[PDB]
Amino acid sequence: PQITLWQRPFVTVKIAGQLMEALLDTGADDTILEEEMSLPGRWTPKVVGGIGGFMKVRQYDQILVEICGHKVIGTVLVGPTPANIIGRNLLTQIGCTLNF
Amino acid sequence: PQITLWQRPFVTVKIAGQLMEALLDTGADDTILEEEMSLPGRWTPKVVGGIGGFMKVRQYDQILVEICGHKVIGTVLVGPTPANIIGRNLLTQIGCTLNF
Ligand SMILES: Cc1cccc(C)c1OCC(=O)N[C@@H](Cc1ccccc1)[C@@H](O)C[C@H](Cc1ccccc1)NC(=O)[C@H](C(C)C)N1CCCNC1=O
């Protein structure tokens, strides 16, 4: 699809059998999911800095993400973010471009 | 142009005779420039919340922004952001779409 930006660019994603909406975010290097997201297995501590300051997150490697049905695999961060965010690490795998 | 997302999507912008680079950010509702940015005239207090928390900003209305040479006019926030960010309020005016 081609998506205009008059509204926030949310899409439905399925991760580890769970459904959620996440923002397609060209300003994000990394993908981050909300605190209540349950991913199994080991993780590594990471800190993410946005506008406002920094927050501690859990880094999960090799997570399968189904983004508008497209299947991709990458690193997913989990922490106390206000919204689920799909960052460039996954946007590149769905062939996402900015056009104008 | 069409821009891929293997790298951060920075573009050059000119605002109030000053040049800077700014991130094209679909995850941002609003446009925010770094604390050292000098805009003339009246402004209104606003607070922006990102990942990490919130920060106090100045809201300037009807600012002319030249984005990749395109001319657009909109609200611009100025505060202690780590990077200049072009949000959807301006991205819509340059006909910016996400494609995949
Ligand atoms: C949502 C919003 C509403 C009104 C006004 C503004 C400016 C708004 O956006 C603020 C905002 O932080 N949006 C983020 C996503 C957002 C949407 C909704 C709520 C909260 C946040 C994101 O798009 C931009 C922001 C840019 C940035 C900040 C600091 C250093 C470098 C880059 N990017 C990041 O925080 C990313 C994260 C998300 C992986 N990030 C973290 C560090 C390393 N690099 C990097 O890419």
TrEMBL record, chains A, B:
Transmembrane feature ranges: none
Peptidase A2 domain ranges (all copies): 20-90
Places the protein is found: Host endosome, Host multivesicular body; Virion membrane
Family: Belongs to the retroviral Pol polyprotein family.
Protein name in the entry: Pol protein
